[PDB]
Amino acid sequence: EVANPEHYIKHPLQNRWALWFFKNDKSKTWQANLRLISKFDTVEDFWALYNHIQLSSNLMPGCDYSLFKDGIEPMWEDEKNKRGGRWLITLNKQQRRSDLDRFWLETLLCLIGESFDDYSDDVCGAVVNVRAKGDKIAIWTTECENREAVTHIGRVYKERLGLPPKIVIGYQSHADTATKSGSTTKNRFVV
């Protein structure tokens, strides 16, 4: 007879995830400032990572955290990102204190808990940008033409963050962002 696995196994995640850090240092290229922190694939190992690293609200201006599925680099040129886009959450300066860390942790829980059900495979990762003008959080998905998947992810994400219905969030294609003239990227979808 063998031991009961409930008593001793770590609780596995559906996916292995990688957390990346972007350091604002303009003596270097964007790609060289983006570096891996570590990977995890259980609930326990997730918390061991999260509990020892700085809250987003404490990072220096211009830094990022990115959590992406193992094998997807947190850059839009990745084969799994290049045809996709992101649901973008823009925060005002006052929301760094009130909402930034709570929203980012909720984003992490949505990813590692596979909270988008049959559209989980469309999720690539998420990014938090710490910025003086206003922080941003985004969930990246793999294909901007997967209308059903993209819309479901957006609606569920907005509910999980607890945004009031009046607050509109937008989905922006990476290719649109990379090719637009002027500073606005249009939204392919809103929710």
Binding site: Q14, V43, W47, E106, L109, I112
Partner: peptide, 14 residues
């Protein structure tokens, strides 16, 4: 698939 509720996940934080 392994799916987890937010409160289940939060129970392991401490």
């Amino acid at each position: 698939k392994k799916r987890y509720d937010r409160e289940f996940l939060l129970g392991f934080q401490f």
